[PDB]
Amino acid sequence: GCPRPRGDNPPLTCSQDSDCLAGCVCGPNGFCG
Numbered sequence: 001g002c003p004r005p006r007g008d009n010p011p012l013t014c015s016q017d018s019d020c021l022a023g024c025v026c027g028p029n030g031f032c033g
Contacts, residue, residue: 002032 002024011033013019014026027033 011031013030014032017026020032024032
């Protein structure tokens with residue numbers, strides 16, 4: 001998964017898998033996971 005995320009921060013948007021860091025994926029709500 002992404003490097004140590006926290007719920008003190010909002011999710012970031014995406015539209016493709018390449019919009020995120022390695023380890024992260026792009027989901028159906030248009031937010032990275």
